[PDB]
Design a protein around this nucleic acid. Structure first.
Ligand code: MG
Ligand code: MG
Ligand code: MG
Length: 131
RNA sequence: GUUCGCGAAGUAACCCUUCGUGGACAUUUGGUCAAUUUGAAACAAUACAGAGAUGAUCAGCAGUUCCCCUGCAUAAGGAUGAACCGUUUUACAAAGAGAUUUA
């Protein structure tokens, strides 16, 4: 299969042309955006992955699992701060959904960092969310 | 080059000519751009074939696209214009049962 950089290169170009064709015809079919992001991670190239998600959000922001996976895409590379900024834009974009708040929480508990989860629940309570 | 005027010389008798000088008249074009190979036409020819819905042979309208072509066109054609026909795993839990480890 692959020999050197140049063969990997053509194996990328071919995929990108193909997929972004299939995204070019359907702006929808979110699973396609997901899968294509996943490929983009397996190429160990993040920057493109970040973009590809961002665009995937500008298509639809009300589909959470793309939020989530665009978190875990930042964490599984063991880079946190992006998985923070993403969370500020997330809960601020969707206060009414729970899974964002809970996930940002757990991210701050497995880091043990309390000052956050204090101030955090201070907000997430202060909005009269529910029981 | 014209004209007004002055001075000088000559002709002269207030002029005809020549020289010098003052003044006025007339007053800023064009370039996005160099002259054939190396700052960009597109077809044709060769080879490979040789027309969507079906079991098969055809009429067709659409729909999406960071594809357009012909047409004056908001008409209508261009294979129903072409491309589409593919790759596909996580909001994830609850109850029960066996093996392993530990307070
Ligand atoms: Mg037509
Ligand atoms: Mg036909
Ligand atoms: Mg058509």
């Amino acid at each position: 299969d692959i020999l050197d950089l140049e063969e990997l290169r053509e194996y990328q170009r071919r995929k990108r042309t193909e997929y972004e064709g299939y995204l070019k015809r359907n702006r929808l079919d979110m699973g396609q955006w997901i899968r294509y992001a996943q490929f983009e991670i397996e190429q160990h190239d993040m920057r493109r992955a970040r973009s590809i998600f961002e665009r995937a959000l500008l298509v639809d922001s009300s589909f959470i699992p793309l939020w989530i996976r665009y978190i875990d895409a930042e964490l599984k590379v063991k880079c946190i701060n992006h998985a923070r900024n993403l969370m500020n834009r997330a809960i601020s974009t969707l206060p009414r959904v729970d899974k964002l708040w809970y996930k940002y929480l757990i991210v701050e508990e497995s880091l043990n960092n309390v000052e956050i989860v204090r101030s955090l629940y201070t907000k997430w309570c202060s909005l009269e969310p529910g029981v």
